[PDB]
Amino acid sequence: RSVASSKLWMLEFSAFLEQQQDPDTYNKHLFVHIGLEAVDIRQIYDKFPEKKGGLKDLFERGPSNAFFLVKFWADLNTNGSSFYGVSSQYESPENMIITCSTKVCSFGKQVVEKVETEYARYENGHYSYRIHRSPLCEYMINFIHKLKHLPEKYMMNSVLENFTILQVVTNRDTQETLLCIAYVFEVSASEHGAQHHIYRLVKE
Amino acid sequence: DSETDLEALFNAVMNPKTANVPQTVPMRLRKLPDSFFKPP
Ligand SMILES: CCCCCCCCCCCCCC(=O)O
């Protein structure tokens, strides 16, 4: 239970491109996947939205154990029949209605927000939530295409310095922050493919 | 004054002579754990 507060645990997170070769054949490439050291949150505030409802506001409001930073090394090594998607799975001891807000940010400014509402399913004494094959927005699809058309890997990492994603999962009724996950990116060079480190965000 | 839009973002890296986006501290130069830049 790495990405887990007192109330919610994200067990799975993956962003992928699925290509339909023929009616019975599908090829799926994972860009990033999840399936703890501390970072001073003040070091990253500039890469995320400010003001009320922004990362600092959310962090100050707490709980402190709900805040995480994920560093992804993304696997971009991949080629009418394309689906770009993201899937994630969560578990809670409580039956809540949750909302998941995903903000794509550039130079700390919100470019798009996706908002998803998820209801609980009973599962072995606890409750499960799944966001299954959420379509990647057009901005993200275009961003990936532009990144891949850059001549050099160092150029891709340069662009990625100022591209972030903020995920805020909230109890809809109470507005309690269940999980807040800040995502930062580099390109993978590894032979194993996509990698990640998960960090706890702390006040200092 | 700088621009913060999608073409400008990639333009700044592809054609640095015409770059007009905000300037920032590189992640490598910030107070971050060593593991941040060394993948497993
Ligand atoms: C370096 C960018 C390629 C890595 C793949 C991006 C990770 C996707 C995170 C989920 C963001 C979903 C936002 C949306 O399109 O609704």
Swiss-Prot record, chain A:
Signal peptide per UniProt: none
Any coiled-coil regions, as ranges: none
Subcellular location: Nucleus
Domain of life: Eukaryota
Tissue specificity of this protein: Preferentially expressed in skeletal muscle. Lower levels in pancreas, placenta, and heart.
Effect in UniProt of substituting F143A: Reduced transforming ability
Effect recorded for D40A: Reduced transforming ability
Effect of L150A: Reduced transforming ability
Subunit structure, interactors included: Interacts with YAP1 and WWTR1/TAZ.
Protein's job: Transcription factor which plays a key role in the Hippo signaling pathway, a pathway involved in organ size control and tumor suppression by restricting proliferation and promoting apoptosis. The core of this pathway is composed of a kinase cascade wherein MST1/MST2, in complex with its regulatory protein SAV1, phosphorylates and activates LATS1/2 in complex with its regulatory protein MOB1, which in turn phosphorylates and inactivates YAP1 oncoprotein and WWTR1/TAZ.
Protein name as catalogued: Transcriptional enhancer factor TEF-3
Organism, as annotated: Homo sapiens
Curated annotation (Swiss-Prot), chain B:
Effect of R30A: Complete loss of interaction with TEAD1
PTM comment, free text: Phosphorylated by LATS1 and LATS2; leading to cytoplasmic translocation and inactivation. Phosphorylated by ABL1; leading to YAP1 stabilization, enhanced interaction with TP73 and recruitment onto proapoptotic genes; in response to DNA damage.
Disulfide bonds: none
Result when mutating V25A: Reduced interaction with TEAD4 and transforming ability
Sites bearing Phosphoserine, chain numbering: S2
Inducing stimuli: Induced in the hours following cyclic mechanical strain in keratinocytes.
Modified sites of kind Phosphothreonine: T4
Localization (cell): Cytoplasm; Nucleus; Cell junction, Tight junction; Cell membrane
Modification N6-lactoyllysine, positions: K31
Coiled-coil region(s): 27-40
Tissue: Increased expression seen in some liver and prostate cancers. Isoforms lacking the transactivation domain found in striatal neurons of patients with Huntington disease (at protein level).
Quaternary structure and partners: Part of a complex when phosphorylated that contains DSG3, PKP1, YAP1 and YWHAG; the complex is required for localization of DSG3 and YAP1 to the cell membrane in keratinocytes. Binds to the SH3 domain of the YES kinase. Binds to WBP1 and WBP2. Binds, in vitro, through the WW1 domain, to neural isoforms of ENAH that contain the PPSY motif. The phosphorylated form interacts with YWHAB. Interacts (via WW domains) with LATS1 (via PPxY motif 2). Interacts with LATS2. Interacts with TEAD1, TEAD2, TEAD3 and TEAD4. Interacts with TP73. Interacts with RUNX1. Interacts with HCK.
Function statement: Transcriptional regulator with dual roles as a coactivator and corepressor. Critical downstream regulatory target in the Hippo signaling pathway, crucial for organ size control and tumor suppression by restricting proliferation and promoting apoptosis. The Hippo signaling pathway core involves a kinase cascade featuring STK3/MST2 and STK4/MST1, along with its regulatory partner SAV1, which phosphorylates and activates LATS1/2 in complex with their regulatory protein, MOB1. This activation leads to the phosphorylation and inactivation of the YAP1 oncoprotein and WWTR1/TAZ.
Domain notes: The first coiled-coil region mediates most of the interaction with TEAD transcription factors.
Associated clinical condition: Coloboma, ocular, with or without hearing impairment, cleft lip/palate, and/or impaired intellectual development: An autosomal dominant disease characterized by uveal colobomata, microphthalmia, cataract and cleft lip/palate. Considerable variability is observed among patients, uveal colobomata being the most constant feature. Some patients manifest intellectual disability of varying degree and/or sensorineural, mid-frequency hearing loss.
Similarity remark: Belongs to the YAP1 family.
Protein name: Transcriptional coactivator YAP1
Natural source organism: Homo sapiens
Shown segment, full-protein numbering: 60 to 99 of 504
